Design a protein around this ligand. Structure first.
Ligand SMILES: C[C@@H]1CCO[C@H]2Cn3cc(C(=O)NCc4ccc(F)cc4F)c(=O)c(O)c3C(=O)N12
Ligand SMILES: C[C@@H]1CCO[C@H]2Cn3cc(C(=O)NCc4ccc(F)cc4F)c(=O)c(O)c3C(=O)N12
Ligand SMILES: [Mg+2]
Ligand SMILES: [Mg+2]
Ligand SMILES: [Mg+2]
Ligand SMILES: [Mg+2]
Ligand SMILES: [Zn+2]
Ligand SMILES: [Zn+2]
Lengths: 261, 61, 47, 261, 61, 47, 239, 239
DNA sequence: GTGGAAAATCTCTAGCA
DNA sequence: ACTGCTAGAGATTTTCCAC
DNA sequence: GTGGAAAATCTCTAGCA
DNA sequence: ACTGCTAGAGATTTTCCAC
């Protein structure tokens, strides 16, 4: 089929046929047809069919600016719990966002904020506010809203709730606060059948308690485990398995072929 | 002594995701929590989940 | 070595080939004529 | 929990809590909480998460108008096979669409055309053209592009192909015809590993041949089958099952409890 | 006589979909074709698919 | 009898309740104050 | 199984239900009933609001008295609408159930009453004064670092809530409030469970006994201030 | 298994491979080889283009000579560009491999040559005239129903292609062309299969035998004009 | 009966605008 | 009484080929 | 061991603009 | 070197309760 390769190359240069067509009409093996297609710069027009996963650490907040009735609503969400805070701000400015961020950092332990590349989030004012409060700034890939999916989703949810309570307030700020209240303490579901406020309290309390307990355990329990290497610190044992860390590489080994001193 | 604290840490529940599956895995059992990774036990299987893919809660159920 | 063809910023036209500098879960850092870009894997194809 | 019902009704009238929250905070059974939620007009804000299925009969074509480089491209797709015909028309007028439809009906057996509610498709001229050619017109639900998914998808595909061959022509009409050629006879895949032209020929030929053969079988084979009912005309038998048609209701019954005279 | 025609009709292949599943089912075996419904056999199972959900082709493989 | 709440024509506001006249696969015909509408089931909720 | 040891421990030391449940591995309902069975064993959502003045500007301060957690905001004027907006913001962030106020005109406005009614808050008319003094001290400390007073106030709130530690355990106000709210959530879940099971009567025929726990293969009940366990097969539960 | 009966049938009657494959349930490759084994036994993509005139307008007509299927279009003028555009449209709709033209200036333009080269069509310079007369008759019949001549031409094409029946089987031009193209597709698939298998050599040692069919549990081969069947275990196939 | 490898099937996403 | 789909990029399950 | 029923888990989609 | 997600509407699988 070697002459078929040249025939198919000309056919593709003309028509840009996919590998199935070339294989069928020139008796090419699928590998050769796929190679012919993959050598054409004009036929590389589709990306991987997958989705990434955003960070869900206890200390990461996702912020965004949504618009409603000509007003600007700045919305922050705790990624690990779904807990939201929203404020109607007079304009999409760096000063307003820095004030919102300082308020947020004064109430909850904000360690990193993830945001789009909007001008307010990229301003030196927000940079100074984050530096003072010790917050790490993450920016998503430009024009990739999926990177902020969580907060984006919440926008939807927030607006929905406003649509249900807008008739109970004279102004949009009051309706926004009502929606925040309803989302945080009147909508139950998720990982633990929790509300958002209950879930965030559980997340933070669990972080503190686990840190404290693990600190005490590591203070008390001291062993070195060899397996198969170097002085690999013991981490956990039981159920016929030993989890250890070596050169800061956590691994799990069977209880056998493992000795603990 | 050490055992009470180990059991207390063991009481926490962990919801996690794998590197390609977008659905959250059920309430695993915590065994170790580190700065970067958490060692959990899900259905007699030990796993080492990155900290960014874990939600640790003591469900008040 | 790899060839990366990508669609970066609200531009339907695909570009490439580019050199793959770093591959991660969900995004790839590539170099396209002395220009470094970070592209989600949904908008990149690696050969 | 009977007093809980009134408490939860007031709580929902205020905050519009979901059934989980009401059940948790008022000890209501899930049925009663769901009933409370379902009685609130303001909480009916989501439809069922399902997609319908478009018609895929051999005689149904889906037509649409797409735009490219300031030009109007009228595209028709044979739903069963994916075979497309595209023409650059001077304007989105009823006369141009009627001419396109008469041309299409003169080449292939068009029995039904499914289109959006665009002005050209709803014009009396297209109605007259379809009446003369004996074509029935189906219009999707307004502002529901999914009803025309097939043709919509093809638009994408068509444009994609044009992007690969636009440099090979000095006009958009030539590029459109090149793209139609490439899609119909240079892209292979789908149900039979076919190309679109081969698939449409197979579909039409199979329709004709099966009609002819079934006519012969029915004229030859005459039987009446009683099962369990009335004089149900026999349809097929074998493999321990009999398929029959009683009162124009096709059904399958076991070979047992079925007698054929 | 009649059996040759029945076998010819049975040679055709049918791809079909169910009322909720969006994925096309494999190449079933045609048994009857009507104006409104097609009776097919897919894995020793007889089904009556509406005509609008069927693609009947004699695969030239 | 049923209650149908629907979103008809590029109008994010939901409407209803309405009387269900006919239910099919992927669409439902409903009556809302002497007005007949055909709505895909993705944009309708039936109780 | 281990109920008798827990009961004896309670009789000796009068311990609380958390301690008994942790020590003797009992479901919390059983420990709560053990505590309530003795006749001699018989706040998280309370906030205190005040409005101070600094540099001729009004600073509305809310203190979680149980923990010392602070929320301060510089408001334009001492107006009822603005106090209501601040209260709604506070209620949407933390589980506020009661608020104490100094009978000021803004705190008694009909707008604030409406806001509290909507948020389900009850109003009652020296933690707050000491906290105001501390907040003013921190504001004075950080005022060199902020051009405006609102930014300085927010910085002071942040420093007080998270960068100041003290007390018996050396904790900050944020950790203390999170722990207190978590304990409140645990208490409310336990109360919900008790309410759920208090409307059952179990026969094990032995008289109508209250139900304390329905396990996988056991039923723990109480009869005449005596806690017993019976097999699921031997027990019959009705409403 | 049924190969010998098919071979004898071909010897007596010299039937084609479709008939033998249908009658004796052989794979088409075996029947094709049986036909090609005898010495005594040794169009679907051909179109005819012309340009007629009617009411002082140019009507370009393409006829599928094998079936009589017509495609007519009123073009602005007898120009090379218009003919090339019509040819590209035709090639994108039906599998055109060859076109016969009347040496007209438009048909010999460099634009038409480029269009045919791109579409992979070979150009060669009384079916067409008779079809033109029939088309003109139908146009005359339907001209009362169309304000313009292009609409009348398209109506005439529709009537001729689908509403006229005749011939041995009483079929329309559309059915005939669909059948002819389907037969062409079958022939090309068979040729692809033969090309795929023609580069194998099978030993069953017996000399190098050509491969005709690789079944699930059999291998049908040909050696010195004798067709035989072997089990897969006894046969060794190489490229 | 069984590894490697090639082929078939399954899963999933952008764009249609 | 009408109705999401198509085609490509990986990934996973299946089958085939020699040992 | 087993039907009904209620509860838990799984599947899927719109909007975020 | 960074990354779709959330919550509601049905549907389907699981478990519980008496017989
Ligand atoms: C003026 C006519 C008549 C009234 O409706 C408008 C608007 N419209 C909109 C889309 C559109 O939204 N395409 C994107 C898309 C989104 C989802 C999906 F499933 C399929 C899709 F194609 C069309 O394709 C389209 O043809 C029209 C159109 O023609 N009209
Ligand atoms: C001017 C800033 C900076 C530069 O980017 C723009 C445009 N933009 C666009 C969307 C948007 O497309 N939302 C719809 C959506 C689509 C898919 C998905 F996964 C999530 C989604 F939210 C935003 O949400 C958004 O915040 C912005 C924005 O802020 N900006
Ligand atoms: Mg934004
Ligand atoms: Mg946004
Ligand atoms: Mg349209
Ligand atoms: Mg369209
Ligand atoms: Zn190409
Ligand atoms: Zn409601």
């Amino acid at each position: 089929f070697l002459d078929g390769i040249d025939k198919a190359q000309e056919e593709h240069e003309k028509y840009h046929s996919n590998w199935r067509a070339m294989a069928s009409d020139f008796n090419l093996p699928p590998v050769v047809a796929k190679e012919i297609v993959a050598s054409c710069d004009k036929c590389q027009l589709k990306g991987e069919a997958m989705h990434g996963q955003v960070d869900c650490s206890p200390g990461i907040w996702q912020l965004d600016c949504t618009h409603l009735e000509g007003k600007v609503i700045l919305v922050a969400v705790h990624v690990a719990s779904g807990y939201i805070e929203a404020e109607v701000i007079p304009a999409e400015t760096g000063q307003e966002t820095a004030y919102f961020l300082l308020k947020l950092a004064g109430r909850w332990p904000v360690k990193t904020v993830h945001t789009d590349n909007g001008s307010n989030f990229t301003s030196t004012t927000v940079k100074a506010a984050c530096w003072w409060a010790g917050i790490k700034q993450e920016f998503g890939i430009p024009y990739n809203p999926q990177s902020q999916g969580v907060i984006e989703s919440m926008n939807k949810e927030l607006k929905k709730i406003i649509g249900q309570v807008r008739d109970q307030a004279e102004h949009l700020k009051t309706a926004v606060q009502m929606a925040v209240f309803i989302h945080n303490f009147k909508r139950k579901g998720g990982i633990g059948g929790y509300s958002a406020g209950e879930r965030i309290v559980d997340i933070i309390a669990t972080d503190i308690q686990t840190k404290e307990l693990q600190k005490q355990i590591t203070k008390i329990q001291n062993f070195r485990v060899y397996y198969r290497k170097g002085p690999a610190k013991l981490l956990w044992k039981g159920e016929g398995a030993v989890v250890i860390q070596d050169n800061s590489d956590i691994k799990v080994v069977p209880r056998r072929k493992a000795k603990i001193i | 002594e050490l055992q009470k604290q180990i059991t207390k840490i063991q009481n926490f529940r962990v919801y996690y995701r794998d590197s390609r599956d977008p659905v959250w895995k059920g309430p695993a059992k915590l065994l170790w929590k580190g700065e970067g990774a958490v060692v959990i036990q899900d259905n007699s299987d030990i796993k080492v989940v990155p900290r960014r893919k874990a939600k640790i809660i003591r469900d008040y159920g | 070595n790899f060839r990366v063809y990508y669609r970066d910023s609200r531009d339907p036209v695909w570009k490439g080939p580019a050199k793959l500098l770093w591959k991660g879960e969900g995004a790839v850092v590539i170099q396209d004529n002395s220009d470094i870009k970070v592209v989600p894997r949904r908008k990149a194809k690696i050969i």
